[PDB]
């Protein structure tokens, strides 16, 4: 479990590097912010998509 | 001296520009709605004549 905590800290470093190692690619042509915005958009679709599942289970 | 030809050419320039303007407006309405406007209906024949 202590080793799993260390692996989680390494994954946090990897996400920082990926977000910042190219927050720079965008500048050369905010990546984290863009990803967050993309995540926000799906929520509405997901549920419109999701509750159909509930009624289809009742139907079949 | 401006004879018949050049005078009518000036008038036709103006009226053809107006005709294209009217086609632009009429087609833009239908395009905004998403209908595929008919070119023959867009042309207002009365303008030039």
């Amino acid at each position: 479990a202590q080793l799993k905590f260390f692996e989680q800290l390494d994954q946090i470093e990897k996400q920082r590097k990926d977000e910042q190692e190219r927050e720079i690619l965008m500048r050369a042509a905010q990546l984290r912010l863009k990803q967050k915005a993309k995540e926000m958009q799906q929520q509405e679709l997901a549920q419109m998509r999701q509750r159909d599942a509930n009624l289809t289970a009742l139907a079949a | 001296l401006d004879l018949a030809g050049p005078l009518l050419a000036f008038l036709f320039r103006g009226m053809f520009k107006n005709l294209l303007k009217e086609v632009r407006i009429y087609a833009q309405k239908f395009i905004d709605r998403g209908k595929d406007f008919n070119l023959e209906l867009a042309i207002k024949t009365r303008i030039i004549s």
């Binding site: - | 008919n38 023959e40 024949t45 009365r46």
Partner: protein, 158 residues
């Protein structure tokens, strides 16, 4: 009972940022603006098939009667105008097919026919039944057939 104003001269007519004519003139009422637009549409449709001005005037009168009668207020304007044009052609003795009217109007044939029935009911009038000889002249001329061929076709149909 109105007027309108132009630019005039170049001085105080345009003000702080080009006020123009102090305004835009802004005239009239819908009970006349809608009729005006319908008249414009009727003239356009008639010119599309080279209808004479007398048929245009008869169509305008028919549309005025229908529009004031108001039994077709729910039907879209252009359909009423197209049906009025068809009825005017029928009354003048030179009928155009419903498809021919639809060719020059954005309204479909079905809607034109429905508005035609409604206009006949509202006006409490009637139109003489079309005969095969009514369309012979236009059909033969558009086909560029000789006069003898047109006569033969008319006689055959009759």
């Amino acid at each position: 009972l109105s007027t309108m104003i132009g630019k005039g001269t170049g001085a105080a007519s345009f003000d702080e940022f080009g006020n123009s004519k102090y305004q835009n003139r802004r005239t009239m009422s819908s009970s006349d603006r809608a009729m005006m637009n319908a008249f414009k549409e009727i003239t356009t449709m008639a010119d599309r098939i080279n209808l004479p001005r007398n048929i245009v005037d008869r169509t305008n009168n028919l549309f005025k009667q229908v529009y004031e009668q108001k039994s077709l207020k729910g039907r879209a304007n252009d359909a009423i105008a197209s049906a009025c044009l068809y009825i005017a052609c029928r009354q003048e003795g030179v009928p155009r097919t419903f498809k021919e009217i639809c060719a020059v109007s954005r309204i479909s044939k079905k809607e034109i026919g429905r508005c035609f029935k409604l206009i006949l009911k509202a006006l409490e009038t009637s139109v003489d039944l079309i005969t095969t000889g009514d369309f012979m002249s236009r059909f033969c001329s558009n086909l560029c057939l000789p006069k003898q061929v047109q006569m033969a076709a008319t006689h055959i149909a009759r």
